[PDB]
Amino acid sequence: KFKPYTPSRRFMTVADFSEITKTEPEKSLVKPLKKTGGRNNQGRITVRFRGGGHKRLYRIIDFKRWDKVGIPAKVAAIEYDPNRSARIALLHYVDGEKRYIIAPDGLQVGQQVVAGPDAPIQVGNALPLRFIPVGTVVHAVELEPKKGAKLARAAGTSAQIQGREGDYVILRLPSGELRKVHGECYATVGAVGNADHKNIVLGKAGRSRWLGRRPHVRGAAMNPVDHPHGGGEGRAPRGRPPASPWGWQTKGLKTRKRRKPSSRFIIARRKK
Amino acid sequence: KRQVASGRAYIHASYNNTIVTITDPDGNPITWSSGGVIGYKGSRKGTPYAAQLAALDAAKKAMAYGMQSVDVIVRGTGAGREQAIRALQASGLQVKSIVDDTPVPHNGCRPKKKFRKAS
Amino acid sequence: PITKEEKQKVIQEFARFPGDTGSTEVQVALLTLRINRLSEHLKVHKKDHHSHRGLLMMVGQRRRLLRYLQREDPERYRALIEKLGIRG
Amino acid sequence: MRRYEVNIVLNPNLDQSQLALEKEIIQRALENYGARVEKVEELGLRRLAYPIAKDPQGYFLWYQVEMPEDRVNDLARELRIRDNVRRVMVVKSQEPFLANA
Amino acid sequence: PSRKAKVKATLGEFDLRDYRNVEVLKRFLSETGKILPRRRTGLSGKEQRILAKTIKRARILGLLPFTEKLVRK
RNA sequence: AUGCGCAGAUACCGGGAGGAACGCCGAUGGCGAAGGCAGCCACCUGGUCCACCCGUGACGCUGAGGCGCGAAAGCGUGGGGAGCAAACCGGAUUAGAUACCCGGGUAGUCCACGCCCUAAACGAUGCGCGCUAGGUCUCUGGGUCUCCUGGGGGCCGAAGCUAACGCG
Numbered sequence: 001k002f003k004p005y006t007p008s009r010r011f012m013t014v015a016d017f018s019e020i021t022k023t024e025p026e027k028s029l030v031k032p033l034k035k036t037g038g039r040n041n042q043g044r045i046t047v048r049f050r051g052g053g054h055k056r057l058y059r060i061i062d063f064k065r066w067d068k069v070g071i072p073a074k075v076a077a078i079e080y081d082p083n084r085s086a087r088i089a090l091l092h093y094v095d096g097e098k099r100y101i102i103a104p105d106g107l108q109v110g111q112q113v114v115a116g117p118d119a120p121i122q123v124g125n126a127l128p129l130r131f132i133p134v135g136t137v138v139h140a141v142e143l144e145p146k147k148g149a150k151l152a153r154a155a156g157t158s159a160q161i162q163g164r165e166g167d168y169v170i171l172r173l174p175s176g177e178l179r180k181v182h183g184e185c186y187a188t189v190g191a192v193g194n195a196d197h198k199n200i201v202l203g204k205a206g207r208s209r210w211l212g213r214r215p216h217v218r219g220a221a222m223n224p225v226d227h228p229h230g231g232g233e234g235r236a237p238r239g240r241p242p243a244s245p246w247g248w249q250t251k252g253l254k255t256r257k258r259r260k261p262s263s264r265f266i267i268a269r270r271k272k
Numbered sequence: 273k274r275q276v277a278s279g280r281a282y283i284h285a286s287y288n289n290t291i292v293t294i295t296d297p298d299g300n301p302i303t304w305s306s307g308g309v310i311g312y313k314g315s316r317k318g319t320p321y322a323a324q325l326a327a328l329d330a331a332k333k334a335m336a337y338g339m340q341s342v343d344v345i346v347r348g349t350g351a352g353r354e355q356a357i358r359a360l361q362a363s364g365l366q367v368k369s370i371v372d373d374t375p376v377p378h379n380g381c382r383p384k385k386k387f388r389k390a391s
Numbered sequence: 392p393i394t395k396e397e398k399q400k401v402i403q404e405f406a407r408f409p410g411d412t413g414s415t416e417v418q419v420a421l422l423t424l425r426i427n428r429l430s431e432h433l434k435v436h437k438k439d440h441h442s443h444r445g446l447l448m449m450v451g452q453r454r455r456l457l458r459y460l461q462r463e464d465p466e467r468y469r470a471l472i473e474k475l476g477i478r479g
Numbered sequence: 480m481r482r483y484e485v486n487i488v489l490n491p492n493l494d495q496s497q498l499a500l501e502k503e504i505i506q507r508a509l510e511n512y513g514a515r516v517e518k519v520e521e522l523g524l525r526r527l528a529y530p531i532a533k534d535p536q537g538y539f540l541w542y543q544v545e546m547p548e549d550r551v552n553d554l555a556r557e558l559r560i561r562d563n564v565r566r567v568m569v570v571k572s573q574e575p576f577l578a579n580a
Numbered sequence: 581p582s583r584k585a586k587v588k589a590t591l592g593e594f595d596l597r598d599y600r601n602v603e604v605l606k607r608f609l610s611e612t613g614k615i616l617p618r619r620r621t622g623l624s625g626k627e628q629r630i631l632a633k634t635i636k637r638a639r640i641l642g643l644l645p646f647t648e649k650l651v652r653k
Numbered sequence: 654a655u656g657c658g659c660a661g662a663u664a665c666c667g668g669g670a671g672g673a674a675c676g677c678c679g680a681u682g683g684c685g686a687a688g689g690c691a692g693c694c695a696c697c698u699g700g701u702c703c704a705c706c707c708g709u710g711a712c713g714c715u716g717a718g719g720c721g722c723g724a725a726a727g728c729g730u731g732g733g734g735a736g737c738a739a740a741c742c743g744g745a746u747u748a749g750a751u752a753c754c755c756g757g758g759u760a761g762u763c764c765a766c767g768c769c770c771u772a773a774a775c776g777a778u779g780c781g782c783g784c785u786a787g788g789u790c791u792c793u794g795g796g797u798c799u800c801c802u803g804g805g806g807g808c809c810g811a812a813g814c815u816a817a818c819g820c821g
Contacts, residue, residue, distance in 0.1 A: 006730085135670065163669055196731070271759090282665055291664050299666025306664080345665080346653055372612070372653025380674030381736040382762095385754095388737085392697070406708085413708025432697060437766095440722055441685070442699040447721075448686090449699090459712030483695085486599070486641060522600070528613070528645040541600075551695050566641045568694065574597040578627055579588060608678095615678035625682070625792055632678055633693085640693050647677075 001025030001078030001109055003087065005196035009203070018208075019201040023087055025078035025109070030090060032100070033060045050214030057082040062099040063140075063149040065126050066186070069116025071095045077109040086155030086194030102140055103193035105157075115189070123190025129169045130183030136161045140188030141171070143181035143263075149188065157192035168263065176271075179264030219243065274302070275338015278368070281330065283357060285350020288318035292330045292356070294339065302337055305329035320352015324359030331363040344370035398424075405474070415460055416471070422453030423475060454478075480513060482572040483551060484543035490563030491524060491537040501561055502540070512554040513547035532565040543572060581619070588622040596630045599637040605644060608635070611652065613645040 007020035035058035040051030059081045073091045076098050080087035089107065092098045104123050107113070113124030121133050126140070137160060139153035153159055153174060160172035168180035202208035209215070220229030220237055228246055230237030240248045254260055280295045286307075293304030305326030307317020316322065334340060350356055361367035382388060401424070403409070405416045429446055433439070457478075460468040472478055489501065509515070519542050526536035546554075551569050559567040590607050599605075608616035615635055618628055639646030 199730075280665080284664060289663095293664055295665050301665050304664065347664085369651075370653050372650035376647075376676070378674075378676040380672090380676090382674090382738090384737075411708060413710095415709060415712080417708075418712095429698075436697080439698070444686075444722065445699045456712055459710095462712065463710090488641060525643070527643040528648065529642060531642055549696055553696095555695075568641045570637070570694070574595065576596045576630065577593045578596050578623065578631065579592045579594055610677090612677085614676095617678070618680080625680090628678075628680085629683095635678070636693055646692090 002106055003078075005200065008201065015203040015207075017201040018203040019199070021197060021200065023078050023080060027077070027079055029057070029079060029081065029100075030098070034058060049217045050209075052210055052215050053213045054211050055082070059083050060100070061088065062101045063152070065115050065149075065188075068093060068095070070114060072112045072114040073099075075107060075109045075111045075113075078103070084154065086192045086197065088193075102188050104139070104188065104190035105193065107190075113189075119189070121189065126186060126188045128184045128186050129181055132161050132164070132169050132183065132187070134161050134163055134169070136189075137191050138187030138189050139192055140186075141181065142186050143179070145182065145185045149186070153192060155192045155194035155197060157195060159187060159191075172266075176269060177264055177266035181263075273337050277339055278341035278366075279339050279343075280345055280371075281334075281342040281360065282345040282347065283327075283350075283353065283360070284345075284347030285323070285353045285356065286318065286348065287351040288315050290318065290323055290326070290350035290353065290356060292326055292360075294330055294334050294337070294342075296339075302339075303330065303333035305333075318351045320350070320355025323350060323352040323354070323356025324362075327356050327359035328363060331360075331365050335365050341366040342368050344368070346370065346372050346374050348374050415456060418453065418456050419471060419475065422449060422456075423477060426450050426453065480545050480547045482517060482543065482545045483569045484518075484541065484572055485514075486539075486541050486566075486568045486570065487558060487564060488537050488539045488566040489561075490532065490565060491534050493538060493563070498538075501563065504561065505540070505558070508554060508557050509544075509546075512550045512557070514544055514550075514554065515546075516542050516544040518543040534565075537565050581622075585620065586622060587616065587620050596627075596634055599634055599641065601634075601638075602643065605635065605638050609644070611648075611650045613648045 001024040003021045003023035005019065005021045007022070009015050009018045009020075035056055038053065040046070040048070040053075061081070061084075071093045073093045076090040076092040078087065079090055080103075081100070086103055088100050088103045090098055091101050107124050111124065113119075113122060115126035117128075118131060119125035119127045121127075121131070121136065123137070126138070128145075129141070137157075139156055139159040140149045140151070141153070141159045142148060142150035144150065151159070151173065156174050158172075158174040162170040162172050162178055164170060164183070165180075167182040167184075169183050170178050170180050172178050219227060219242075220231050221227045222231040222233075224231035224237075228241045228243050229239070242248055274296070276297060279297045280299075282291075282293045282295060282301075282304075284291050289307030289312075291304065291306040293301045295301035305328070307319075307322045307326065309329065310317065310322040310325045312322050334342075344357065344360070383390075398421075401420050402411070402417050405411075405420045406414060407416065411417060426446065426449065433443055433446065457468070457471075460471065493501075521538075521540040521542070524536060524538045531537075555567055555569055558564050587607060591604050594601075594604055608621060610616045615632065621627065621631065623631055638644045
């Protein structure tokens with residue numbers, strides 16, 4: 001029920017460089033799931049470019065485990081949703097009920113794993129940080145206990161356990177930074193399920209992108225009647241500005257944001 | 273002052289500057305000296321001479337605290353590590369036992385040209 | 392792995408006569424068997440070019456011996472072919 | 480099945496019922512794989528010449544036995560499993576060589 | 581070869597086929613738990629080899645420092 | 654110089670993480686078509702040395718062509734970068750310094766699967782056999798093991814070979 005990434009159509013005219021992926025569980029989801037409105041327009045004013053749609057399923061997923069902190073679960077199997085950067089495992093809880101959950105590193109259908117008060121540090125179970133075997137990996141992870149799985153490292157194979165101090169453990173998050181969460185808080189054990197996805201290649205843009213749902217963006221689009229920047233000519237403007245009365249693209253946003261100093265440091269950057 | 277009669281004397285040395293320091297019985301220290309500590313700069317600081325001097329300082333201070341007995345820790349090698357260590361036993365202030373480390377590699381990280389010319 | 396016992400047992404099934412403690416028959420039985428479980432291994436592995444190689448030489452050897460097999464007599468030989476399976 | 484000597488060191492700070500549960504795990508596991516002793520030994524607890532396991536001493540167990548060859552790897556992993564297994568070591572069963580005779 | 585110590589005659593009939601020989605094994609340790617050489621065990625290729633191997637086995641699981649803070653220097 | 658440190662570094666102590674490498678032993682030593690291959694353990698494997706003379710019965714030596722194989726560099730996607738590090742940036746230089754030196758830091762260096770076959774690819778010397786003093790050392794298999802014998806490595810080395818080395 002894993003999934004092929006690479007399959008690429010071939011020379012079926014410019015449908016060139018189209019990357020397929022196929023989770024093998026292929027089953028159509030199950031019983032627990034509604035749908036999302038057609039947002040893009042919202043609070044009934046309209047906003048943010050692109051946006052279009054394309055077919056309609058729509059998710060409900062588990063984001064909180066302490067709610068059975070124990071009932072082993074066995075991979076119902078693999079599958080996913082018209083959302084999320086890295087598929088899911090519909091899991092079965094030994095008590096009858098099941099739940100759509102993450103999809104850490106390639107686990108295995110039928111596999112038992114669970115979590116709570118002491119779970120075996122086997123990628124799959126989840127645990128209050130504290131049970132953090134420092135130097136290990138998780139994601140999903142949530143600071144401010146109860147505030148549900150906060151930091152759903154999307155396909156975000158990224159929760160790197162980095163030491164502890166006080167009632168907070170240190171973590172290396174996607175981004176390339178290290179924040180802190182009080183141990184009692186929690187983490188889904190292990191890592192994500194998708195990345196190659198991230199590399200996926202798609203053919204005739206219009207076709208693909210739109211299918212994605214998203215349409216466009218078109219800067220200093222000539223007639224700068226608005227389009228912040230210049231136009232009514234070839235030449236790329238100067239000032240150094242962006243759409244809807246913008247600050248270019250090299251300035252802050254944070255602030256006192258009591259948030260900030262409160263934890264984390266590394267400051268915002270990487271260097272591949 | 274903390275005072276604890278015995279501790280460790282760390283003698284570590286480069287070859288254009290060397291260093292020594294007083295550490296308690298366990299591992300922290302209190303005072304020290306070195307090549308450029310000895311009103312020195314550039315080379316020079318890499319003389320068994322300075323060695324002798326900073327040794328000296330390490331000493332006067334050494335007494336200056338409830339200590340003087342010590343085991344010698346060996347780190348690397350200094351251009352005059354001797355004139356150094358001898359200055360050491362010299363001020364006596366106690367000239368106890370000596371430990372051997374200068375913690376060898378084991379082969380795991382090619383150097384810089386310097387000792388690469390050492391195929 | 393190399394199961395000496397069963398080995399001898401087949402050196403036997405083959406060596407028409409119980410006194411073939413080294414004969415074309417056996418070169419056959421042996422190089423064959425070996426060649427086979429060996430190769431199968433090769434598969435679930437993919438990279439041991441050195442030994443692949445040897446195996447190579449070996450298979451050659453065997454086949455060639457058979458070459459002669461035919462040379463003097465391929466009759467009894469084709470029977471062998473038969474018994475075994477290889478070259479079909 | 481061949482025979483190798485099972486030399487494996489397990490935590491020092493152990494105790495009673497613990498010695499019980501994990502050493503027995505040792506057992507039924509072994510068997511489950513294809514193990515079955517030949518020499519049930521061990522020399523108890525002992526120190527080492529280098530603070531491994533963050534300790535200067537631990538408990539060492541040695542039982543040499545018959546097993547299904549290849550399974551070795553397998554159980555081995557099964558062993559190291561149990562945390563405390565400060566060292567999981569198996570060796571082909573040989574023993575001859577008188578030097579200085 | 582230099583001679584004033586030697587060891588091939590420290591212990592007689594010794595089975596190299598071991599590891600749990602704290603004592604004998606030790607008998608080649610010197611200071612920084614090196615491996616006291618042909619230069620001392622005066623033990624044929626066969627020897628330095630297998631003997632070595634176990635030396636190995638020994639540091640391996642443990643119980644022997646395969647080097648160690650030297651006290652004296 | 655430099656760049657880094659009293660917003661305390663450089664040294665000492667404890668703890669954390671990870672990548673790479675693999676000391677003494679280990680050798681002027683070993684295994685491999687070659688390339689080249691090492692901390693130990695285990696899985697599967699191949700070349701290959703000795704002795705009983707037991708089996709078969711010369712089936713064997715050669716290899717144009719092809720077929721698989723392999724330095725390091727570099728490419729391809731997907732991991733990973735502790736250190737080292739063309740490129741780049743400095744600092745030192747001379748008259749000049751893009752390089753030899755010191756201070757930095759990418760790609761790469763490393764793993765998987767795919768791809769390049771590349772060469773002072775070397776012993777600059779194709780392979781297969783048998784004939785012609787000895788001397789010495791070293792590893793390894795068999796023995797009546799002051800040594801002998803099969804094999805394997807460096808050394809000295811009559812004859813002899815070459816324009817000359819030097820092969821032996």
